[PDB]
Amino acid sequence: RTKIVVKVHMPCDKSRAKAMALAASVNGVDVVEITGEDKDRLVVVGRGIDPVRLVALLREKCGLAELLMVELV
Amino acid sequence: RTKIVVKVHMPCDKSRAKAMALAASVNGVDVVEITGEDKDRLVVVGRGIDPVRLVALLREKCGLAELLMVELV
Amino acid sequence: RTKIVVKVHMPCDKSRAKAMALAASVNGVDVVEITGEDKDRLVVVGRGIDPVRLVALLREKCGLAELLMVELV
Amino acid sequence: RTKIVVKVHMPCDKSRAKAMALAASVNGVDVVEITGEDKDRLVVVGRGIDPVRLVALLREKCGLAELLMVELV
Amino acid sequence: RTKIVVKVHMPCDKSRAKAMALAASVNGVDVVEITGEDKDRLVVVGRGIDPVRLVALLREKCGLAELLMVELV
Amino acid sequence: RTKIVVKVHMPCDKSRAKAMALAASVNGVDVVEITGEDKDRLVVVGRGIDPVRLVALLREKCGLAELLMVELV
Amino acid sequence: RTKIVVKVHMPCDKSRAKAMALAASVNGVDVVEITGEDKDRLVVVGRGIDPVRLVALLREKCGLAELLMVELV
Amino acid sequence: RTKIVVKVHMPCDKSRAKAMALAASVNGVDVVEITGEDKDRLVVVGRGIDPVRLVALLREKCGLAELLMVELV
Amino acid sequence: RTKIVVKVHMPCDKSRAKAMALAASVNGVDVVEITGEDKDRLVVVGRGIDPVRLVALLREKCGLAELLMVELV
Amino acid sequence: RTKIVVKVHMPCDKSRAKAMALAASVNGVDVVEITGEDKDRLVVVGRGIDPVRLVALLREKCGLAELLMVELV
Amino acid sequence: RTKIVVKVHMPCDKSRAKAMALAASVNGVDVVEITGEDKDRLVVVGRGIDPVRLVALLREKCGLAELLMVELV
Amino acid sequence: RTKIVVKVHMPCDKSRAKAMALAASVNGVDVVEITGEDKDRLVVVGRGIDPVRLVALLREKCGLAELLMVELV
Amino acid sequence: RTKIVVKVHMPCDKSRAKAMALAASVNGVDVVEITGEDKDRLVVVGRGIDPVRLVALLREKCGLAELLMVELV
């Protein structure tokens, strides 16, 4: 199990649901949550997640997406 | 902000992803989580979520779902 | 069976007993307890107990009651 | 706080509810519970309860009452 | 110097606040307090109050209302 | 003779057993099987099977179930 | 997995259902079937089946049971 | 004399002849018959018949034998 | 179904059992019996029995067999 | 569940009551009955009855008894 | 000969044998039986039985007992 | 809904009136009626009657009383 | 001279005669009598009576018998 933290631009709600649903759609993901002072940290925890192709999908479908953390549990 | 626990028929991983992404796509949802020894408990946390509509939508796309818990956070 | 948590403003023993005896008179109720570091959580467990009706009746008789949780056991 | 168990004649639901509401009505009571295999064991937990007047109050309003356990926790 | 007690149908805190504010709006009332074991009684004190208009407005805007007492102080 | 396929939330082996035995205990049933990649398809073959009754029994003593197919052999 | 064939005295539908439900109730069983020109051979397939325990259960509740074959698949 | 009934699985007639000829081979036996709507009841009457020994003989050579009755005539 | 009576020379235990086990051995027989004042009458009832064949093989294995009665029941 | 018929010396009705109450007091016994033209046949039906211990007990308190029949139901 | 049906609280085996041995001990009783879906119908058949003193004795030592039927044969 | 017939010793009209009045007083009695060739039977009809206390009362206050019939309508 | 009393299971007149004639057939016996409220006591009085042999004779040809008394006259 891995923990991924992505800084994403998600000003409103329809866009924060957009990022959340896209990360949730990756097989193996068992936790998705938005955290941080500025509602800017998408954290994805699961198994068999490729952090690279996940952040690529975020950038293609949302906006800027920087990968801040990839850690084991 | 309320927390909702739904028992959902999601026996594999493409089906867990589809329930996670469905819950995630609801505006105001902040946390979607897979839990339970049998991995059939969808935990959903967020603002102004309608648990009845949520469970009906899970029922539509996953075929079988049952509300277990609604809690004010 | 079902577990229901109501937050009730019951600062002294008489208001505590009023809320607890009231919930205990509801047919189908097999557990009542006051919990929480603030001693403000009324826990009611039983069969066929309607959450809305119980809060309504806490509001009619004692006042200062808020539904916190409803959970299948 | 202490724990008290009284075997009470409680055949139906009007009878459980008045036994339970009676115990819940005494000051200091934290927990009231209907236990046992035949639903005759009224568990009462709380502070400063005199088991003697409580069973006396139960005999006086719910028929035969049998003090079976009092113990500190 | 007249004191008025009205039994009102107000079985929740929202309802109790509404009946109290309406009572305090009528000409001549100095003080509105709520009383009664189940918080179903307004006490209204003042000079030059018409209790007929007071109770009739509570009936129109807040449901059922019964004038229990009109007495000097 | 008739074949029926029911999707059933039977995530573990104990609940698969109870779905199997429920179907098996219907008089006339010649075949009960757990099929499907996700081991969630109960197939029943026999004489005088009532599909609606059987799903209802499955719901009642198994939780969630959905009729997928009724076929005459 | 393992296939088991047991000869069982089950001359009517109620005793066919009895033996069939009995085998179905064994954890790990995914196939139960009545075969044979004489309708007296029940086929049990699944995982972790203890043949002695199964046949002894059939005999203890149906009177007559005789293990014919144990076959790996 | 003594009458013994054994339930025997004898679906065809080589198995019926085999059980019935073997019970007849027992010295002391002056009646054997196959009775029952299921034709599964081997009845044997005679003098000095040991029921335990006869059923053991049936189990050794035929299999699928169960003692149903022993009565003095 | 048909009834046959044969006078057989069967003086001792072994000879009765041999006679009766051979009649019991014929397919279709469902009762065999030794009646008669002096032990000598072998009663055989069943379906599709040929009396001449039966007596023939009795004479071959027990010496002297006389056919006394053939009757439909 | 077995049925047991015992011949018991119970010539009057104080002694029939003695035998019937002793059979009745055996755990698992659900039918006791006086039968026979001479009213000396005690019929006992139930679960886990030991016929020999039962006859021995009848013999101890009624003086004479003899086992006549043991039958599976 | 009269038939008597008493509803008796006899949840375990020791308790059903206590009631039965008490009814069997009544002179003139020739049948005692437990029936009903819930095994709570004590059936007593015999001669010169007073149902009143019988149900009184039942209540005196086996909880409560309700006389459901007195009828002739 | 039950009908009770009591043979009562009441050999004159004063006695007949007394026993009927007594029967009409006990709980659950709706109708009392005198019958029999010699006007010696009570017919008592009602719901929730204890026949034991009824016949015991007649025994205590009006002499001999035999419960001939307890039966539903 | 000696007197012997035997309890015999002789529930009809046919078997009382068999017991009587048996005791009478013993050389040296000059009194045989059926005594007792329940007519089950055989009294034998005479010379050279073997009590054990007589009871053995009674059992062998009368069924059940129990020696009650042996007295020298």
Side-chain angles (χ1 to χ4, degrees):
Chain A
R1 267 180 99 227
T2 50
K3 183 159 115 214
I4 301 156
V5 173
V6 196
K7 207 203 191 98
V8 192
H9 179 63
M10 313 176 289
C12 66
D13 268 12
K14 84 104 200 179
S15 89
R16 72 196 320 257
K18 213 192 198 181
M20 282 217 338
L22 184 128
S25 73
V26 176
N27 296 345
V29 169
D30 64 20
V31 193
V32 184
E33 44 180 351
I34 287 170
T35 182
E37 290 287 326
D38 307 78
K39 77 142 293 197
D40 47 326
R41 286 185 163 57
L42 185 62
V43 48
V44 177
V45 181
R47 302 185 204 264
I49 324 173
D50 176 14
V52 193
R53 84 154 157 54
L54 158 78
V55 175
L57 247 174
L58 288 162
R59 294 185 203 190
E60 175 204 319
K61 264 324 289 172
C62 291
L64 72 73
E66 280 148 15
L67 173 44
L68 285 299
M69 160 187 267
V70 172
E71 178 198 358
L72 284 209
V73 200
Chain B
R1 214 169 103 88
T2 86
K3 163 179 186 172
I4 288 159
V5 178
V6 190
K7 169 148 72 189
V8 180
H9 186 78
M10 32 193 191
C12 68
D13 223 301
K14 145 159 178 182
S15 84
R16 278 184 207 105
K18 295 212 282 232
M20 290 273 286
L22 212 71
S25 68
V26 177
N27 287 23
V29 161
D30 309 334
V31 176
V32 299
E33 192 174 6
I34 301 278
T35 196
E37 165 184 338
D38 290 340
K39 275 171 162 73
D40 57 347
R41 315 292 166 100
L42 186 73
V43 186
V44 182
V45 189
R47 303 171 83 218
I49 56 199
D50 176 359
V52 156
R53 200 183 82 94
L54 181 66
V55 171
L57 259 288
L58 291 167
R59 253 177 217 123
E60 261 164 47
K61 195 41 58 196
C62 291
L64 294 162
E66 173 200 1
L67 177 63
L68 298 189
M69 197 223 71
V70 182
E71 178 185 32
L72 251 72
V73 184
Chain C
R1 301 217 325 168
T2 279
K3 165 182 198 172
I4 293 158
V5 183
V6 187
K7 178 147 66 182
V8 181
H9 181 79
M10 35 198 179
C12 68
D13 277 20
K14 149 154 58 82
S15 56
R16 277 198 275 277
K18 182 167 186 177
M20 278 217 334
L22 189 63
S25 77
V26 175
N27 287 359
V29 160
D30 47 46
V31 179
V32 197
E33 39 182 354
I34 301 198
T35 206
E37 154 203 8
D38 298 330
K39 328 256 175 103
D40 55 3
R41 315 304 176 83
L42 183 64
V43 185
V44 176
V45 194
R47 300 210 138 245
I49 54 186
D50 177 358
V52 181
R53 189 251 307 110
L54 163 74
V55 178
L57 171 133
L58 284 173
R59 291 191 171 148
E60 162 184 28
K61 284 298 199 320
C62 313
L64 310 160
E66 188 183 17
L67 179 54
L68 285 200
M69 202 212 50
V70 182
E71 178 182 41
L72 295 185
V73 47
Chain D
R1 49 202 308 263
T2 77
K3 169 195 187 185
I4 307 165
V5 194
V6 188
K7 149 182 271 204
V8 185
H9 171 69
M10 319 185 284
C12 63
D13 283 38
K14 279 197 219 188
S15 35
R16 306 216 308 181
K18 181 44 83 38
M20 262 194 137
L22 203 87
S25 100
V26 155
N27 273 21
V29 180
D30 199 298
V31 162
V32 302
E33 198 171 357
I34 303 284
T35 198
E37 258 206 316
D38 227 7
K39 158 268 198 71
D40 58 342
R41 275 173 180 51
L42 180 62
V43 177
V44 171
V45 198
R47 92 151 152 181
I49 315 175
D50 183 5
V52 190
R53 43 198 305 274
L54 167 69
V55 160
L57 267 277
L58 282 167
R59 293 173 179 173
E60 183 196 318
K61 288 170 233 266
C62 320
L64 281 310
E66 200 188 333
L67 184 36
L68 306 187
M69 163 171 17
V70 316
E71 84 182 356
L72 267 77
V73 47
Chain E
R1 82 260 202 216
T2 166
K3 166 188 189 177
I4 299 150
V5 185
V6 195
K7 200 176 133 186
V8 189
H9 172 247
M10 42 194 187
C12 66
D13 286 347
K14 208 188 168 202
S15 270
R16 290 174 182 117
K18 192 59 232 68
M20 288 178 73
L22 204 76
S25 65
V26 314
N27 282 8
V29 47
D30 298 332
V31 188
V32 188
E33 299 188 32
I34 182 151
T35 194
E37 170 62 29
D38 303 332
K39 285 145 187 196
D40 50 355
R41 271 147 215 155
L42 305 182
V43 184
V44 176
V45 180
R47 254 222 204 275
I49 306 155
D50 178 18
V52 188
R53 212 289 189 281
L54 169 73
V55 179
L57 205 78
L58 293 164
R59 302 211 185 136
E60 174 198 350
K61 311 278 195 210
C62 300
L64 271 37
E66 318 169 11
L67 184 45
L68 299 187
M69 176 192 294
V70 175
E71 158 202 67
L72 290 203
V73 67
Chain F
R1 223 151 84 102
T2 280
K3 174 179 179 193
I4 291 158
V5 181
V6 196
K7 176 138 70 180
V8 180
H9 192 56
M10 30 186 188
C12 63
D13 259 334
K14 179 172 174 167
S15 69
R16 274 183 279 263
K18 186 145 26 67
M20 289 268 294
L22 263 207
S25 65
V26 180
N27 274 42
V29 165
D30 307 359
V31 186
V32 187
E33 309 184 349
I34 301 298
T35 200
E37 320 65 47
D38 293 325
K39 291 169 172 55
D40 69 345
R41 314 302 168 96
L42 182 65
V43 47
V44 189
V45 194
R47 300 220 90 199
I49 325 176
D50 181 9
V52 176
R53 184 212 24 83
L54 176 71
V55 168
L57 308 190
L58 284 167
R59 293 207 231 278
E60 183 174 46
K61 310 172 121 260
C62 226
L64 319 180
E66 170 187 18
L67 184 64
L68 291 193
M69 204 252 270
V70 184
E71 184 177 36
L72 266 44
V73 197
Chain G
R1 278 200 328 148
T2 296
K3 172 178 191 158
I4 287 317
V5 189
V6 197
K7 189 134 81 171
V8 186
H9 196 69
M10 37 190 176
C12 62
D13 269 349
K14 171 240 80 188
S15 54
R16 281 181 257 277
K18 211 213 173 302
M20 195 137 32
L22 201 66
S25 65
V26 168
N27 270 29
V29 163
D30 46 55
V31 173
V32 181
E33 206 178 354
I34 307 273
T35 189
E37 181 195 17
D38 290 299
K39 305 228 155 191
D40 63 345
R41 295 169 86 237
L42 90 161
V43 178
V44 190
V45 192
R47 275 170 245 277
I49 299 150
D50 169 3
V52 173
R53 193 182 108 83
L54 186 57
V55 175
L57 260 160
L58 289 166
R59 199 186 300 95
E60 160 180 3
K61 327 288 250 194
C62 291
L64 292 316
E66 198 176 70
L67 182 66
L68 300 183
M69 182 205 265
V70 186
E71 177 179 38
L72 290 309
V73 278
Chain H
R1 319 199 318 169
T2 281
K3 167 192 198 165
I4 304 158
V5 178
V6 188
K7 172 144 61 206
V8 179
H9 188 80
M10 33 200 180
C12 69
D13 53 340
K14 110 165 286 184
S15 54
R16 274 196 282 267
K18 170 165 204 198
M20 175 178 242
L22 176 130
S25 95
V26 174
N27 296 11
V29 167
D30 41 47
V31 183
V32 317
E33 5 163 35
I34 300 186
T35 198
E37 320 228 329
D38 299 327
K39 317 232 191 282
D40 52 2
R41 267 146 182 71
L42 181 65
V43 47
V44 170
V45 47
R47 318 197 114 257
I49 308 304
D50 182 0
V52 171
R53 177 198 31 66
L54 161 77
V55 172
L57 190 48
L58 285 173
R59 296 185 165 156
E60 179 207 348
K61 303 239 146 205
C62 312
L64 295 159
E66 185 182 26
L67 179 63
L68 288 199
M69 196 206 52
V70 182
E71 61 168 341
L72 314 189
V73 194
Chain I
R1 213 161 86 101
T2 297
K3 186 193 200 185
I4 320 292
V5 183
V6 190
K7 150 196 277 293
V8 192
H9 175 249
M10 306 186 273
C12 59
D13 268 36
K14 289 196 325 163
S15 56
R16 293 170 243 125
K18 166 97 172 322
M20 258 196 319
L22 196 91
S25 163
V26 160
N27 280 32
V29 184
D30 46 54
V31 315
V32 312
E33 208 175 342
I34 289 151
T35 183
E37 175 128 41
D38 220 347
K39 173 279 305 150
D40 47 5
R41 288 148 42 88
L42 182 55
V43 180
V44 169
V45 186
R47 314 196 145 76
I49 311 176
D50 186 9
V52 47
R53 195 200 29 77
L54 174 60
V55 170
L57 288 321
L58 275 169
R59 290 171 182 179
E60 168 181 353
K61 318 296 175 45
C62 314
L64 244 182
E66 160 170 43
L67 192 271
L68 294 73
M69 191 244 269
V70 173
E71 187 188 61
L72 269 79
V73 47
Chain J
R1 214 165 108 91
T2 74
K3 174 170 139 113
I4 287 145
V5 186
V6 184
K7 185 148 78 193
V8 181
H9 187 72
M10 28 183 198
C12 70
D13 267 351
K14 161 151 172 197
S15 63
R16 289 180 189 107
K18 289 207 326 170
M20 253 180 102
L22 168 62
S25 74
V26 176
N27 283 2
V29 156
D30 45 51
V31 179
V32 312
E33 211 183 345
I34 301 295
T35 206
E37 185 203 0
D38 301 305
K39 288 198 227 120
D40 54 346
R41 310 310 166 88
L42 186 72
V43 180
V44 185
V45 190
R47 317 154 294 121
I49 317 174
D50 176 75
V52 157
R53 175 226 60 209
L54 173 64
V55 177
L57 255 295
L58 290 165
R59 265 197 212 97
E60 274 172 17
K61 253 52 218 198
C62 298
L64 293 314
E66 166 198 18
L67 170 63
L68 296 186
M69 194 226 57
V70 189
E71 172 179 33
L72 256 74
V73 317
Chain K
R1 287 222 313 158
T2 76
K3 178 174 172 183
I4 294 157
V5 182
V6 198
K7 202 201 201 96
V8 176
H9 173 55
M10 31 179 209
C12 67
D13 266 3
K14 185 178 339 193
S15 161
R16 310 143 53 74
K18 192 155 127 166
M20 270 179 91
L22 185 99
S25 80
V26 172
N27 287 0
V29 165
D30 56 36
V31 186
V32 183
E33 242 189 306
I34 312 297
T35 193
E37 181 189 1
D38 303 78
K39 305 252 67 190
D40 48 350
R41 310 296 216 254
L42 206 185
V43 171
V44 183
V45 186
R47 295 184 156 94
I49 316 163
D50 172 23
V52 189
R53 164 245 192 174
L54 164 65
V55 170
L57 226 56
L58 280 169
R59 291 176 190 168
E60 189 180 351
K61 265 265 279 202
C62 316
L64 206 34
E66 162 161 30
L67 192 40
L68 302 177
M69 173 176 129
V70 168
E71 167 204 313
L72 266 68
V73 198
Chain L
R1 67 271 310 123
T2 167
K3 162 199 199 167
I4 295 141
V5 178
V6 191
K7 189 171 143 191
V8 182
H9 169 85
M10 35 187 189
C12 64
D13 282 347
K14 207 199 165 180
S15 275
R16 282 178 192 114
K18 185 36 165 223
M20 291 175 85
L22 213 60
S25 69
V26 317
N27 293 348
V29 163
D30 297 326
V31 186
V32 190
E33 215 158 357
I34 191 97
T35 198
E37 171 66 44
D38 297 338
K39 291 161 185 199
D40 54 352
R41 276 136 202 58
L42 295 195
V43 180
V44 169
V45 181
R47 327 319 196 190
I49 309 160
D50 176 27
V52 186
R53 162 98 176 287
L54 172 81
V55 179
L57 202 47
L58 299 167
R59 283 180 181 167
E60 173 196 341
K61 310 245 174 146
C62 320
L64 275 43
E66 312 164 20
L67 181 44
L68 302 183
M69 172 198 274
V70 180
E71 147 196 269
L72 297 197
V73 280
Chain M
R1 262 167 74 88
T2 308
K3 177 181 176 199
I4 283 71
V5 182
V6 190
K7 178 138 64 182
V8 184
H9 189 58
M10 35 191 179
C12 56
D13 284 10
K14 189 156 150 188
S15 53
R16 280 184 274 267
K18 264 171 209 184
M20 290 264 299
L22 202 90
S25 60
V26 172
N27 278 33
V29 159
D30 45 52
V31 184
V32 180
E33 145 174 39
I34 300 296
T35 199
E37 309 60 15
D38 298 321
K39 315 171 154 47
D40 65 344
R41 312 297 160 104
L42 190 71
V43 185
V44 186
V45 189
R47 295 150 300 118
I49 300 167
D50 182 3
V52 302
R53 183 181 151 283
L54 181 81
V55 179
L57 275 151
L58 289 163
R59 298 212 260 258
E60 196 195 24
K61 317 250 132 229
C62 216
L64 311 69
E66 167 183 34
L67 180 75
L68 295 193
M69 199 247 291
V70 182
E71 183 182 30
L72 284 164
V73 187

